[PDB]
Amino acid sequence: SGNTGSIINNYYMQQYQNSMDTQLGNDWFSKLASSAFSGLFGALLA
Amino acid sequence: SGNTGSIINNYYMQQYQNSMDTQLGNDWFSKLASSAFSGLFGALLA
Amino acid sequence: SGNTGSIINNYYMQQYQNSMDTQLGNDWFSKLASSAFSGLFGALLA
Amino acid sequence: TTSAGESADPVTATVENYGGETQVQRRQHTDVSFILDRFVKVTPKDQINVLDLMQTPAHTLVGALLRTATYYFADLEVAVKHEGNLTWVPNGAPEAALDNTTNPTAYHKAPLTRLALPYTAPHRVLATVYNGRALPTSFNYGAIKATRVTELLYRMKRAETYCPRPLLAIHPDQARHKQKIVAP
Amino acid sequence: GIFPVACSDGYGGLVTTDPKTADPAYGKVFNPPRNMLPGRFTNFLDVAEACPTFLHFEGDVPYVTTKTDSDRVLAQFDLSLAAKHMSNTFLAGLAQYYTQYSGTINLHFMFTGPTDAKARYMIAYAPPGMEPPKTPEAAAHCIHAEWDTGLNSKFTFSIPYLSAADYAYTASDTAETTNVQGWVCLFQITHGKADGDALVVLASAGKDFELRLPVDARTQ
Amino acid sequence: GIFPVACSDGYGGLVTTDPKTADPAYGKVFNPPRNMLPGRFTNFLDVAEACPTFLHFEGDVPYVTTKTDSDRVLAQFDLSLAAKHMSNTFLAGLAQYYTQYSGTINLHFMFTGPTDAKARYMIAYAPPGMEPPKTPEAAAHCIHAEWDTGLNSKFTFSIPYLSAADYAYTASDTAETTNVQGWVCLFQITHGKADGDALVVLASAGKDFELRLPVDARTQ
Amino acid sequence: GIFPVACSDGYGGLVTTDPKTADPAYGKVFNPPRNMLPGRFTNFLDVAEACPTFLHFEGDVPYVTTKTDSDRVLAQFDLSLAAKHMSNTFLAGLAQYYTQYSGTINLHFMFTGPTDAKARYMIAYAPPGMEPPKTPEAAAHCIHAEWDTGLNSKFTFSIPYLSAADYAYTASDTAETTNVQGWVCLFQITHGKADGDALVVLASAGKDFELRLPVDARTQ
């Protein structure tokens, strides 16, 4: 999450360091990045 | 690398102590050292 | 070697605490101690 | 052990030749990586000090050995007996870059500063002599500043130079230089 | 007794990056839900690369109008992040925070003029060692390319990563007026009733692009 | 509660060699490549041994000219690193940094004169207890060897490691004018139209050579 | 975060015996060889036991001359290490450093006189509670033994370990003039032309011997 290179369980329990992200029931920017064509709208020569 | 006689993983993670040497694709002075003949250009006697 | 009752590898590596005794190729006072007869140069009586 | 000499192919010789035996040397000490890992206290010129190496006394062990192999690579372990808060800044980073606490702005304790330092040059390798008193502005391992720095030491790490240079010393005068050792 | 310990001097004195974490003193907190939340992202060279920006310019406008004289050069400047036109763009509005970089950057072109405005442009890229041209003729000797307006408008040219060191800085000095990375320079062939048109150029991160060594230092 | 601890006095107070390592506070740095880079090396007795050097001398020149009188002795001096001729050489330009040593060192010879200059030399090696000779005759009683110019020029003689203690120092005192290691001494048999020629002697580390106990102490 | 710790007061403040070891800051040292080196040893009650010593005496001489009167008693004194004759001997030249002890000590006898000098001696050993005799007659009631010169000269008698506590001290006071361990006393039967001879007595550690509790305290 940035700079956490501790080899231990950072001692203090899981439900203690940070606050647990309850669920319900690059995410997207990587989705529209990994899809850019380097092709050619004609046909390469030489 | 000089004087590192620690029995642990020096705590702080691998990608943290030193900067990782990315590859690509005595090294040599030992190569031209380990090849010096103590022979004789004639023939030993006695 | 005197008073070393540490339960760990005294942390710092082997080739670090003391200087390694290179070989070559009571030792004796115990040899001339463990050989003293309590016998009798005649013959016990009574 | 005769041979051709204007060929300069390494042509050593050893004991056995005329007699005697040859031994099992333990050069562990003349190990380049080993004898370069041990701090050098260079003058921390004021506060804004650049992690250069040709600043160090070209006569100290880690200095000398340093000035003997043209190329090289290694990391850093510093020391800073000082005042205020050491706020180091990477290589290339604007002189001015070193000031904002957000940057690695260490907080004083007692008494110096022992921290690790990556080798951060854009070049795949560095040198004490660039043929390109006159050596490159990318040749700096970052740059420190606090608010008064009294002790500057650089424990070079994971050392490894390349290519060689000339090693000479204390020009005697009596074919044998005399200087008091350690006596009983 | 108890395990001895060496209260070692110099290890632990607060570092604005210290690897370890601090102590938690509240704990047992169950937050709300962060499920499939819109347009997230986690890398700035992801949106940089993923969503280009136009360039500031002489005057300020992004576009550029067809010269109708021999003076063809439509652009020209220092090939580095200091580049004023870039200095504001998204990729430049951040490389500030990173001392060095490597990779490739892109220059996307567009027309806006009438269909009765058929036109031709050029893109030269010279390096450090000489000063940029002013004649596509002299320029056609760098690593370039020629194109002309059509059906499809846009077009994105990737400019090469060339430098002695695999890197070099984003900052600059009045020592680097010879720039360690070149003076990219765009020109203008010929055209037709296509004078005064708009050829806006934008900028994204090419795939080769990379950025490293975080440096924060007063920027507004 | 928590694990007790003995804040032990005297353990951890900064040592210019301290075995342990410090703390890293940047991390995650991927460097450039150091692949098969030219002429590396990692031991100074590797290049010492691997690439000899000539010796400074009376005057300064490295070579030596054939005496044309009874005075034959071409060389002679203290067999120790303090040796002025060596004090500059590569092996000597470093043994400074190591209090002791053991092993063997080599003395390579060369001629440079005409082919009409056939010549003969000698190499004596006496020890501590007596002063070196001046007559190959008296000298032929040490551990020596004789040679004469030919087709092949060079020749490297290894001088023996002899001392009470398996070691002894590189430094010296005005107490050791009797040297704990000997006075090696080179001479000159006879020759022909081979007077005033050049017999340059160099120095490398023999295989037996070894060096230990790092000592740094002001040297320029 | 990190592992909490109790900087416990009073644990670690330098002890001239502290079990733990200090920190090493040079390391990687390969020493010379210590192979089968002469007359080693590793215990002082090994050489004590293994190589006896004679006893200082009235005057100073070690030996003793045959009384030629009724006064037979050849020796007599405090059975403890304080024993002047012992106080110098090897076993006594060390028990200084150990508060207590237990075990047995030995008294070796020897003659030196002519073969025309046949003689007889005695060795009595009385305990605490009474003062030593002066008449082998009265003495023959302690734990003793009789012997007479012959072919073999030497002879070593072991004196018994008797004390309430399995131990007792090596030191002494002007409170212990009644000694907690006895007054061993040697005498002299009869003889022949064997007056004025030399019966030197030495001392080693018997097998039963033991020594403990190290105490250092000014001794020259």
PDB file of N, CA and C in Angstrom, chain D residues 1 3-6 11-14 18 23 25 27 29-30 32 35 59-61 64 68-69 73 77 114 116 124 155 160-163 167-168 171 173 175-176 178-181, chain F residues 17-18 21-23 32 34 39-41 43-44 49 78 83-84 88-89 93 97-98 106 110 152-154 156-158 160 171-174 176-177 207-209 216 218 220:
ATOM      1  N   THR D   1      61.638 -19.145 -14.396  1.00  0.00           N
ATOM      2  CA  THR D   1      60.593 -19.314 -15.455  1.00  0.00           C
ATOM      3  C   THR D   1      60.754 -18.303 -16.603  1.00  0.00           C
ATOM      4  N   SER D   3      60.638 -16.993 -20.659  1.00  0.00           N
ATOM      5  CA  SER D   3      59.491 -16.828 -21.546  1.00  0.00           C
ATOM      6  C   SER D   3      59.758 -15.656 -22.470  1.00  0.00           C
ATOM      7  N   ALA D   4      58.785 -15.349 -23.327  1.00  0.00           N
ATOM      8  CA  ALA D   4      58.884 -14.198 -24.222  1.00  0.00           C
ATOM      9  C   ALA D   4      58.296 -13.000 -23.416  1.00  0.00           C
ATOM     10  N   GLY D   5      58.978 -11.854 -23.403  1.00  0.00           N
ATOM     11  CA  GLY D   5      58.474 -10.723 -22.635  1.00  0.00           C
ATOM     12  C   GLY D   5      57.795  -9.580 -23.379  1.00  0.00           C
ATOM     13  N   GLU D   6      58.130  -9.390 -24.643  1.00  0.00           N
ATOM     14  CA  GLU D   6      57.512  -8.320 -25.402  1.00  0.00           C
ATOM     15  C   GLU D   6      56.112  -8.761 -25.834  1.00  0.00           C
ATOM     16  N   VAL D  11      52.822 -14.334 -17.516  1.00  0.00           N
ATOM     17  CA  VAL D  11      53.837 -15.395 -17.389  1.00  0.00           C
ATOM     18  C   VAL D  11      54.480 -15.362 -15.984  1.00  0.00           C
ATOM     19  N   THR D  12      53.727 -15.720 -14.945  1.00  0.00           N
ATOM     20  CA  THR D  12      54.255 -15.700 -13.568  1.00  0.00           C
ATOM     21  C   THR D  12      55.327 -16.781 -13.367  1.00  0.00           C
ATOM     22  N   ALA D  13      55.602 -17.060 -12.093  1.00  0.00           N
ATOM     23  CA  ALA D  13      56.557 -18.068 -11.645  1.00  0.00           C
ATOM     24  C   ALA D  13      56.238 -18.284 -10.175  1.00  0.00           C
ATOM     25  N   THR D  14      56.738 -19.375  -9.608  1.00  0.00           N
ATOM     26  CA  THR D  14      56.487 -19.666  -8.205  1.00  0.00           C
ATOM     27  C   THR D  14      57.529 -20.560  -7.575  1.00  0.00           C
ATOM     28  N   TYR D  18      63.033 -23.604  -8.189  1.00  0.00           N
ATOM     29  CA  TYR D  18      64.378 -23.931  -7.739  1.00  0.00           C
ATOM     30  C   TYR D  18      64.341 -24.769  -6.483  1.00  0.00           C
ATOM     31  N   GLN D  23      52.239 -22.448  -0.729  1.00  0.00           N
ATOM     32  CA  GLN D  23      51.152 -22.531   0.217  1.00  0.00           C
ATOM     33  C   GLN D  23      49.705 -22.177  -0.216  1.00  0.00           C
ATOM     34  N   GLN D  25      47.060 -19.706   0.452  1.00  0.00           N
ATOM     35  CA  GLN D  25      46.759 -18.377   0.955  1.00  0.00           C
ATOM     36  C   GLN D  25      45.271 -18.108   1.119  1.00  0.00           C
ATOM     37  N   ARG D  27      43.368 -14.957   1.152  1.00  0.00           N
ATOM     38  CA  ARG D  27      43.264 -13.534   0.820  1.00  0.00           C
ATOM     39  C   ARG D  27      41.947 -12.836   1.158  1.00  0.00           C
ATOM     40  N   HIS D  29      40.852 -10.980   2.948  1.00  0.00           N
ATOM     41  CA  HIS D  29      40.957  -9.576   3.245  1.00  0.00           C
ATOM     42  C   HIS D  29      41.164  -8.671   2.064  1.00  0.00           C
ATOM     43  N   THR D  30      41.902  -9.146   1.074  1.00  0.00           N
ATOM     44  CA  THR D  30      42.139  -8.355  -0.123  1.00  0.00           C
ATOM     45  C   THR D  30      40.943  -8.527  -1.054  1.00  0.00           C
ATOM     46  N   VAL D  32      37.959  -7.168  -2.707  1.00  0.00           N
ATOM     47  CA  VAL D  32      37.427  -5.858  -3.088  1.00  0.00           C
ATOM     48  C   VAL D  32      36.070  -5.426  -2.490  1.00  0.00           C
ATOM     49  N   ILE D  35      36.763  -5.080   1.682  1.00  0.00           N
ATOM     50  CA  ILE D  35      37.543  -3.936   2.130  1.00  0.00           C
ATOM     51  C   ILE D  35      37.159  -2.602   1.504  1.00  0.00           C
ATOM     52  N   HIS D  59      43.265   9.424   0.038  1.00  0.00           N
ATOM     53  CA  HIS D  59      44.400   8.805   0.699  1.00  0.00           C
ATOM     54  C   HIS D  59      43.921   7.795   1.727  1.00  0.00           C
ATOM     55  N   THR D  60      42.617   7.787   1.979  1.00  0.00           N
ATOM     56  CA  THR D  60      42.049   6.858   2.938  1.00  0.00           C
ATOM     57  C   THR D  60      41.836   5.533   2.249  1.00  0.00           C
ATOM     58  N   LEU D  61      41.618   4.491   3.042  1.00  0.00           N
ATOM     59  CA  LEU D  61      41.435   3.162   2.497  1.00  0.00           C
ATOM     60  C   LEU D  61      40.309   3.184   1.500  1.00  0.00           C
ATOM     61  N   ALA D  64      41.281   5.682  -1.323  1.00  0.00           N
ATOM     62  CA  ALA D  64      42.301   5.165  -2.206  1.00  0.00           C
ATOM     63  C   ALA D  64      41.722   4.039  -3.061  1.00  0.00           C
ATOM     64  N   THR D  68      41.276   3.665  -7.430  1.00  0.00           N
ATOM     65  CA  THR D  68      42.121   2.723  -8.167  1.00  0.00           C
ATOM     66  C   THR D  68      41.418   1.894  -9.261  1.00  0.00           C
ATOM     67  N   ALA D  69      40.090   1.929  -9.306  1.00  0.00           N
ATOM     68  CA  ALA D  69      39.354   1.195 -10.332  1.00  0.00           C
ATOM     69  C   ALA D  69      38.346   2.126 -11.011  1.00  0.00           C
ATOM     70  N   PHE D  73      30.206   0.424  -9.140  1.00  0.00           N
ATOM     71  CA  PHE D  73      28.824   0.433  -8.728  1.00  0.00           C
ATOM     72  C   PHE D  73      28.800   0.059  -7.259  1.00  0.00           C
ATOM     73  N   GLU D  77      25.475   3.723   2.656  1.00  0.00           N
ATOM     74  CA  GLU D  77      25.091   3.683   4.052  1.00  0.00           C
ATOM     75  C   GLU D  77      25.859   4.863   4.615  1.00  0.00           C
ATOM     76  N   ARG D 114      21.960   6.864  10.702  1.00  0.00           N
ATOM     77  CA  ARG D 114      22.356   5.688   9.975  1.00  0.00           C
ATOM     78  C   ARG D 114      21.144   5.304   9.151  1.00  0.00           C
ATOM     79  N   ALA D 116      20.044   3.639   4.898  1.00  0.00           N
ATOM     80  CA  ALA D 116      20.526   2.941   3.705  1.00  0.00           C
ATOM     81  C   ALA D 116      20.337   3.850   2.485  1.00  0.00           C
ATOM     82  N   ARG D 124      23.987   3.208 -16.335  1.00  0.00           N
ATOM     83  CA  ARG D 124      24.103   1.827 -15.891  1.00  0.00           C
ATOM     84  C   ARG D 124      25.324   1.666 -15.003  1.00  0.00           C
ATOM     85  N   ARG D 155      29.510   4.594   3.988  1.00  0.00           N
ATOM     86  CA  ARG D 155      29.854   3.175   3.903  1.00  0.00           C
ATOM     87  C   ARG D 155      29.365   2.687   2.556  1.00  0.00           C
ATOM     88  N   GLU D 160      31.741  -3.079  -6.245  1.00  0.00           N
ATOM     89  CA  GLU D 160      32.131  -3.792  -7.448  1.00  0.00           C
ATOM     90  C   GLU D 160      32.567  -2.861  -8.575  1.00  0.00           C
ATOM     91  N   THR D 161      33.864  -2.618  -8.683  1.00  0.00           N
ATOM     92  CA  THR D 161      34.358  -1.758  -9.743  1.00  0.00           C
ATOM     93  C   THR D 161      34.637  -2.611 -10.966  1.00  0.00           C
ATOM     94  N   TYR D 162      35.342  -2.025 -11.929  1.00  0.00           N
ATOM     95  CA  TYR D 162      35.710  -2.682 -13.182  1.00  0.00           C
ATOM     96  C   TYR D 162      36.926  -1.913 -13.691  1.00  0.00           C
ATOM     97  N   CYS D 163      37.805  -2.581 -14.428  1.00  0.00           N
ATOM     98  CA  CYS D 163      38.977  -1.905 -14.956  1.00  0.00           C
ATOM     99  C   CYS D 163      39.848  -1.440 -13.785  1.00  0.00           C
ATOM    100  N   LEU D 167      48.463   2.164  -8.400  1.00  0.00           N
ATOM    101  CA  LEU D 167      48.585   2.161  -6.940  1.00  0.00           C
ATOM    102  C   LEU D 167      50.014   2.351  -6.430  1.00  0.00           C
ATOM    103  N   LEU D 168      50.251   3.520  -5.852  1.00  0.00           N
ATOM    104  CA  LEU D 168      51.554   3.893  -5.323  1.00  0.00           C
ATOM    105  C   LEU D 168      51.387   4.383  -3.892  1.00  0.00           C
ATOM    106  N   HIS D 171      56.255   7.838  -0.699  1.00  0.00           N
ATOM    107  CA  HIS D 171      57.604   7.786  -1.247  1.00  0.00           C
ATOM    108  C   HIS D 171      58.646   7.876  -0.140  1.00  0.00           C
ATOM    109  N   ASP D 173      62.690   7.142   1.217  1.00  0.00           N
ATOM    110  CA  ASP D 173      63.915   7.867   0.894  1.00  0.00           C
ATOM    111  C   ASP D 173      65.152   6.986   1.148  1.00  0.00           C
ATOM    112  N   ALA D 175      65.140   3.608   0.810  1.00  0.00           N
ATOM    113  CA  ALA D 175      64.766   2.313   0.241  1.00  0.00           C
ATOM    114  C   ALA D 175      63.903   1.518   1.217  1.00  0.00           C
ATOM    115  N   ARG D 176      63.695   2.086   2.408  1.00  0.00           N
ATOM    116  CA  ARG D 176      62.887   1.485   3.476  1.00  0.00           C
ATOM    117  C   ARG D 176      62.321   2.609   4.349  1.00  0.00           C
ATOM    118  N   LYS D 178      60.653   4.259   7.330  1.00  0.00           N
ATOM    119  CA  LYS D 178      60.508   3.996   8.766  1.00  0.00           C
ATOM    120  C   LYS D 178      59.378   4.809   9.454  1.00  0.00           C
ATOM    121  N   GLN D 179      58.509   4.125  10.214  1.00  0.00           N
ATOM    122  CA  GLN D 179      57.372   4.741  10.939  1.00  0.00           C
ATOM    123  C   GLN D 179      56.844   3.863  12.095  1.00  0.00           C
ATOM    124  N   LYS D 180      57.024   4.321  13.336  1.00  0.00           N
ATOM    125  CA  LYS D 180      56.608   3.601  14.559  1.00  0.00           C
ATOM    126  C   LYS D 180      55.303   2.795  14.517  1.00  0.00           C
ATOM    127  N   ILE D 181      55.420   1.474  14.674  1.00  0.00           N
ATOM    128  CA  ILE D 181      54.247   0.593  14.664  1.00  0.00           C
ATOM    129  C   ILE D 181      53.623   0.509  16.053  1.00  0.00           C
TER     130      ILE D 181
ATOM    131  N   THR F  17      32.458  -0.564  11.014  1.00  0.00           N
ATOM    132  CA  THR F  17      32.659  -1.894  10.494  1.00  0.00           C
ATOM    133  C   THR F  17      31.473  -2.738  10.930  1.00  0.00           C
ATOM    134  N   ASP F  18      30.713  -2.190  11.876  1.00  0.00           N
ATOM    135  CA  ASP F  18      29.552  -2.870  12.424  1.00  0.00           C
ATOM    136  C   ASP F  18      29.046  -3.857  11.376  1.00  0.00           C
ATOM    137  N   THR F  21      23.436  -4.214   9.223  1.00  0.00           N
ATOM    138  CA  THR F  21      23.165  -3.182   8.233  1.00  0.00           C
ATOM    139  C   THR F  21      22.195  -2.143   8.807  1.00  0.00           C
ATOM    140  N   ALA F  22      22.103  -0.991   8.142  1.00  0.00           N
ATOM    141  CA  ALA F  22      21.220   0.098   8.568  1.00  0.00           C
ATOM    142  C   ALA F  22      19.809  -0.078   8.020  1.00  0.00           C
ATOM    143  N   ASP F  23      18.980   0.946   8.175  1.00  0.00           N
ATOM    144  CA  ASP F  23      17.625   0.850   7.674  1.00  0.00           C
ATOM    145  C   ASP F  23      17.466   1.493   6.310  1.00  0.00           C
ATOM    146  N   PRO F  32      19.916  -0.072 -13.712  1.00  0.00           N
ATOM    147  CA  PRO F  32      20.115  -0.364 -15.133  1.00  0.00           C
ATOM    148  C   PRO F  32      20.747  -1.749 -15.232  1.00  0.00           C
ATOM    149  N   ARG F  34      23.996  -4.356 -15.636  1.00  0.00           N
ATOM    150  CA  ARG F  34      25.449  -4.484 -15.446  1.00  0.00           C
ATOM    151  C   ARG F  34      25.901  -5.781 -16.091  1.00  0.00           C
ATOM    152  N   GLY F  39      36.466  -5.748 -18.273  1.00  0.00           N
ATOM    153  CA  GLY F  39      37.469  -5.906 -17.235  1.00  0.00           C
ATOM    154  C   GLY F  39      37.182  -5.736 -15.765  1.00  0.00           C
ATOM    155  N   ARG F  40      36.128  -6.376 -15.282  1.00  0.00           N
ATOM    156  CA  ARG F  40      35.808  -6.302 -13.869  1.00  0.00           C
ATOM    157  C   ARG F  40      36.966  -6.929 -13.057  1.00  0.00           C
ATOM    158  N   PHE F  41      36.685  -7.256 -11.796  1.00  0.00           N
ATOM    159  CA  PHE F  41      37.619  -7.887 -10.869  1.00  0.00           C
ATOM    160  C   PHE F  41      37.099  -7.658  -9.454  1.00  0.00           C
ATOM    161  N   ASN F  43      39.218  -8.479  -6.092  1.00  0.00           N
ATOM    162  CA  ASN F  43      40.307  -8.876  -5.217  1.00  0.00           C
ATOM    163  C   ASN F  43      41.488  -8.117  -5.780  1.00  0.00           C
ATOM    164  N   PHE F  44      42.239  -7.440  -4.916  1.00  0.00           N
ATOM    165  CA  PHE F  44      43.378  -6.659  -5.381  1.00  0.00           C
ATOM    166  C   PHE F  44      44.674  -7.420  -5.505  1.00  0.00           C
ATOM    167  N   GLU F  49      48.792  -9.812  -8.646  1.00  0.00           N
ATOM    168  CA  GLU F  49      49.338 -11.078  -9.144  1.00  0.00           C
ATOM    169  C   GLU F  49      49.254 -11.079 -10.684  1.00  0.00           C
ATOM    170  N   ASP F  78      66.565  -3.684   1.011  1.00  0.00           N
ATOM    171  CA  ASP F  78      65.721  -4.314   2.023  1.00  0.00           C
ATOM    172  C   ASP F  78      64.568  -5.138   1.432  1.00  0.00           C
ATOM    173  N   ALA F  83      60.587  -1.267   0.624  1.00  0.00           N
ATOM    174  CA  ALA F  83      61.490  -1.164  -0.526  1.00  0.00           C
ATOM    175  C   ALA F  83      61.062  -0.024  -1.416  1.00  0.00           C
ATOM    176  N   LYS F  84      61.888   1.015  -1.468  1.00  0.00           N
ATOM    177  CA  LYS F  84      61.574   2.201  -2.256  1.00  0.00           C
ATOM    178  C   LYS F  84      61.139   1.897  -3.692  1.00  0.00           C
ATOM    179  N   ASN F  88      55.571   2.144  -4.591  1.00  0.00           N
ATOM    180  CA  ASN F  88      54.964   2.865  -5.710  1.00  0.00           C
ATOM    181  C   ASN F  88      54.358   1.796  -6.638  1.00  0.00           C
ATOM    182  N   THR F  89      55.082   0.686  -6.799  1.00  0.00           N
ATOM    183  CA  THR F  89      54.656  -0.448  -7.626  1.00  0.00           C
ATOM    184  C   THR F  89      53.229  -0.821  -7.278  1.00  0.00           C
ATOM    185  N   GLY F  93      51.956  -0.436  -3.811  1.00  0.00           N
ATOM    186  CA  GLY F  93      51.027   0.675  -3.785  1.00  0.00           C
ATOM    187  C   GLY F  93      49.721   0.259  -3.133  1.00  0.00           C
ATOM    188  N   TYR F  97      47.883  -0.737   3.125  1.00  0.00           N
ATOM    189  CA  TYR F  97      46.617  -0.975   3.780  1.00  0.00           C
ATOM    190  C   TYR F  97      46.456  -2.282   4.547  1.00  0.00           C
ATOM    191  N   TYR F  98      47.510  -3.090   4.608  1.00  0.00           N
ATOM    192  CA  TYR F  98      47.447  -4.364   5.327  1.00  0.00           C
ATOM    193  C   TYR F  98      48.690  -4.581   6.168  1.00  0.00           C
ATOM    194  N   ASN F 106      57.314 -11.818  -7.081  1.00  0.00           N
ATOM    195  CA  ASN F 106      58.140 -12.125  -8.233  1.00  0.00           C
ATOM    196  C   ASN F 106      58.948 -10.984  -8.845  1.00  0.00           C
ATOM    197  N   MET F 110      64.171  -8.407 -18.118  1.00  0.00           N
ATOM    198  CA  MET F 110      64.090  -8.171 -19.552  1.00  0.00           C
ATOM    199  C   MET F 110      65.330  -7.459 -20.049  1.00  0.00           C
ATOM    200  N   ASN F 152      64.070 -15.847 -26.203  1.00  0.00           N
ATOM    201  CA  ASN F 152      63.021 -15.380 -25.335  1.00  0.00           C
ATOM    202  C   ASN F 152      63.728 -14.412 -24.396  1.00  0.00           C
ATOM    203  N   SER F 153      63.082 -13.285 -24.157  1.00  0.00           N
ATOM    204  CA  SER F 153      63.647 -12.236 -23.334  1.00  0.00           C
ATOM    205  C   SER F 153      63.315 -12.313 -21.845  1.00  0.00           C
ATOM    206  N   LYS F 154      62.034 -12.154 -21.523  1.00  0.00           N
ATOM    207  CA  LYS F 154      61.576 -12.163 -20.140  1.00  0.00           C
ATOM    208  C   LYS F 154      61.961 -13.396 -19.341  1.00  0.00           C
ATOM    209  N   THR F 156      60.765 -14.628 -15.046  1.00  0.00           N
ATOM    210  CA  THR F 156      60.261 -14.221 -13.734  1.00  0.00           C
ATOM    211  C   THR F 156      60.668 -15.164 -12.587  1.00  0.00           C
ATOM    212  N   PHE F 157      61.515 -14.683 -11.681  1.00  0.00           N
ATOM    213  CA  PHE F 157      61.946 -15.515 -10.556  1.00  0.00           C
ATOM    214  C   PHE F 157      61.142 -15.249  -9.308  1.00  0.00           C
ATOM    215  N   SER F 158      60.660 -16.326  -8.704  1.00  0.00           N
ATOM    216  CA  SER F 158      59.903 -16.204  -7.477  1.00  0.00           C
ATOM    217  C   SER F 158      60.854 -16.259  -6.276  1.00  0.00           C
ATOM    218  N   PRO F 160      61.332 -16.765  -2.308  1.00  0.00           N
ATOM    219  CA  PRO F 160      60.840 -17.531  -1.149  1.00  0.00           C
ATOM    220  C   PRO F 160      60.297 -16.821   0.080  1.00  0.00           C
ATOM    221  N   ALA F 171      55.132  -2.620   7.276  1.00  0.00           N
ATOM    222  CA  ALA F 171      55.717  -1.371   7.746  1.00  0.00           C
ATOM    223  C   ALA F 171      57.154  -1.674   8.165  1.00  0.00           C
ATOM    224  N   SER F 172      57.804  -0.730   8.848  1.00  0.00           N
ATOM    225  CA  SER F 172      59.188  -0.921   9.320  1.00  0.00           C
ATOM    226  C   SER F 172      59.599   0.174  10.330  1.00  0.00           C
ATOM    227  N   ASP F 173      60.692  -0.065  11.072  1.00  0.00           N
ATOM    228  CA  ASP F 173      61.218   0.870  12.088  1.00  0.00           C
ATOM    229  C   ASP F 173      62.751   0.984  12.067  1.00  0.00           C
ATOM    230  N   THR F 174      63.296   1.929  12.836  1.00  0.00           N
ATOM    231  CA  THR F 174      64.750   2.069  12.933  1.00  0.00           C
ATOM    232  C   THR F 174      65.127   1.203  14.105  1.00  0.00           C
ATOM    233  N   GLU F 176      64.270  -2.235  12.989  1.00  0.00           N
ATOM    234  CA  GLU F 176      64.257  -3.300  11.992  1.00  0.00           C
ATOM    235  C   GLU F 176      65.294  -3.047  10.902  1.00  0.00           C
ATOM    236  N   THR F 177      66.310  -2.224  11.166  1.00  0.00           N
ATOM    237  CA  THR F 177      67.314  -1.993  10.127  1.00  0.00           C
ATOM    238  C   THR F 177      68.029  -3.335   9.866  1.00  0.00           C
ATOM    239  N   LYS F 207      52.028 -17.169  -6.583  1.00  0.00           N
ATOM    240  CA  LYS F 207      50.819 -17.870  -6.155  1.00  0.00           C
ATOM    241  C   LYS F 207      50.742 -18.002  -4.626  1.00  0.00           C
ATOM    242  N   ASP F 208      51.890 -18.228  -3.995  1.00  0.00           N
ATOM    243  CA  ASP F 208      51.975 -18.377  -2.547  1.00  0.00           C
ATOM    244  C   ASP F 208      51.509 -17.127  -1.793  1.00  0.00           C
ATOM    245  N   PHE F 209      51.554 -15.983  -2.460  1.00  0.00           N
ATOM    246  CA  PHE F 209      51.188 -14.711  -1.844  1.00  0.00           C
ATOM    247  C   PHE F 209      49.824 -14.646  -1.138  1.00  0.00           C
ATOM    248  N   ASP F 216      44.162   1.288   7.657  1.00  0.00           N
ATOM    249  CA  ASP F 216      44.147   2.524   6.875  1.00  0.00           C
ATOM    250  C   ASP F 216      44.887   3.589   7.710  1.00  0.00           C
ATOM    251  N   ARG F 218      46.608   7.380   6.500  1.00  0.00           N
ATOM    252  CA  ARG F 218      47.262   8.508   5.816  1.00  0.00           C
ATOM    253  C   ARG F 218      48.366   8.139   4.812  1.00  0.00           C
ATOM    254  N   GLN F 220      49.831   9.260   0.714  1.00  0.00           N
ATOM    255  CA  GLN F 220      49.825   9.958  -0.592  1.00  0.00           C
ATOM    256  C   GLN F 220      51.245  10.103  -1.191  1.00  0.00           C
TER     257      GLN F 220
END
